[PDB]
Amino acid sequence: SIGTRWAVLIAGSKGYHNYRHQADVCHMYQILRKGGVKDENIIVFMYDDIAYNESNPFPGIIINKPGGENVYKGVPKDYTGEDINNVNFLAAILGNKSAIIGGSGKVLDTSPNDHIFIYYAXGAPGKIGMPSKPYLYADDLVDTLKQKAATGTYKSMVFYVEAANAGSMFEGLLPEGTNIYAMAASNSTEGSWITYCPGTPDFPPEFDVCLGDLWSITFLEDCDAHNLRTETVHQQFELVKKKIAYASTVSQYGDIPISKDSLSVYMGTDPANDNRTFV
Numbered sequence: 600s601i602g603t604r605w606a607v608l609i610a611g612s613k614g615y616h617n618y619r620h621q622a623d624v625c626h627m628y629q630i631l632r633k634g635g636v637k638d639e640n641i642i643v644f645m646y647d648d649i650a651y652n653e654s655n656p657f658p659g660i661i662i663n664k665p666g667g668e669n670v671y672k673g674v675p676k677d678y679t680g681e682d683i684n685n686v687n688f689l690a691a692i693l694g695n696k697s698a699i700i701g702g703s704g705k706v707l708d709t710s711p712n713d714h715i716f717i718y719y720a721x722g723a724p725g726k727i728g729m730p731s732k733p734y735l736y737a738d739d740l741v742d743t744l745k746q747k748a749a750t751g752t753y754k755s756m757v758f759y760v761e762a763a764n765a766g767s768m769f770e771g772l773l774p775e776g777t778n779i780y781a782m783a784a785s786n787s788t789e790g791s792w793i794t795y796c797p798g799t800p801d802f803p804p805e806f807d808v809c810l811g812d813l814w815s816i817t818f819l820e821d822c823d824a825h826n827l828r829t830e831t832v833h834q835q836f837e838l839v840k841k842k843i844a845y846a847s848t849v850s851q852y853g854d855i856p857i858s859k860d861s862l863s864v865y866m867g868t869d870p871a872n873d874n875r876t877f878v
């Protein structure tokens with residue numbers, strides 16, 4: 600069978616100054632929606648304190664680029680507030696609705712021919728953030744991926760991580776023979792760069808916070824610019840790695856042959872870009 604495309608999108612932070620992590624994740628949702636991925640198969644973890652924040656100059660709107668579209672519109676709210684935590688994130692990956700404690704109960708209850716795309720935005724050596732402690736440590740995330748692999752409930756999985764030291768979540772830990780490929784904004788010893796901040800030329804005067812993260816907006820704007828049936832994960836890896844080489848080293852881990860897949864295997868493609876063949 601062709602299977603179904605599923606995704607987990609998670610912004611691991613809270614607070615209006617962290618606008619960018621929720622904007623990054625809402626942008627990824629818009630790409631999946633335009634690609635034909637269904638809401639029932641997209642699990643969203645976002646604190647939800649940005650859109651109607653008294654500090655937002657545009658209530659109900661979240662943008663991930665100056666003059667960009669409203670990426671908040673229609674985004675599902677599976678886990679918001681303090682329901683974003685290691686217990687719910689790991690149970691959602693595993694697909695066990697009986698292990699969720701608070702939230703909508705939407706989980707990756709996948710079948711062997713399904714594809715999974717996971718995107719996290721919001722890091723330190725060996726761990727990534729949750730809105731409140733405890734943070735998510737490398738071993739606990741990788742052990743959850745090993746449990747998922749042992750169930751055999753997926754064809755292949757692609758995991759994208761936007762965080763400082765992102766590569767430390769997988770380096771020397773992520774198995775290479777279980778059809779899981781991971782791409783990280785930075786390697787184990789590097790920080791990550793924020794972008795679309797106030798001060799840069801032609802920036803809107805209403806904002807006092809950064810609208811995105813450099814690696815995230817580089818791969819997200821690439822997804823928006825091409826027919827994703829003509830671009831592989833490997834082609835995106837090479838393009839984004841070269842594009843932000845001055846800021847961080849884009850790194851890959853796990854089952855590298857999985858990146859031979861076209862991005863559309865995970866994300867679909869927007870018909871508006873059908874003529875935009877990748878070169």
Ligand SMILES: *[C@@H]1O[C@H](CO[C@@H]2O[C@@H](C)[C@@H](O)[C@@H](O)[C@@H]2O)[C@@H](O)[C@H](O)[C@H]1NC(C)=O
Nearest residue numbers: 686690693694695696697698699700746750
């Ligand atoms: C799915 O999860 C069920 C419930 O797990 C129990 O409750 C959660 C909240 C944790 O406290 C966990 O440690 C408990 O065991 C399990 O009973 C069930 O076996 C799981 N199903 C599968 C197929 O793994």
Ligand SMILES: *[C@@H]1O[C@H](CO)[C@@H](O)[C@H](O)[C@H]1NC(C)=O
Nearest residue numbers: 614615616648649651652653
């Ligand atoms: C708005 O953002 C501030 C950050 O200063 C946060 O403390 C507050 O809880 C947020 N409020 C709402 C209603 O989202």
Ligand SMILES: *[C@@H]1O[C@H](CO)[C@@H](O)[C@H](O)[C@H]1NC(C)=O
Nearest residue numbers: 770785786787788789847848
């Ligand atoms: C991580 O990137 C730095 C450059 O920022 C490089 O010097 C270092 O060798 C890299 N580490 C690994 C394990 O590749």
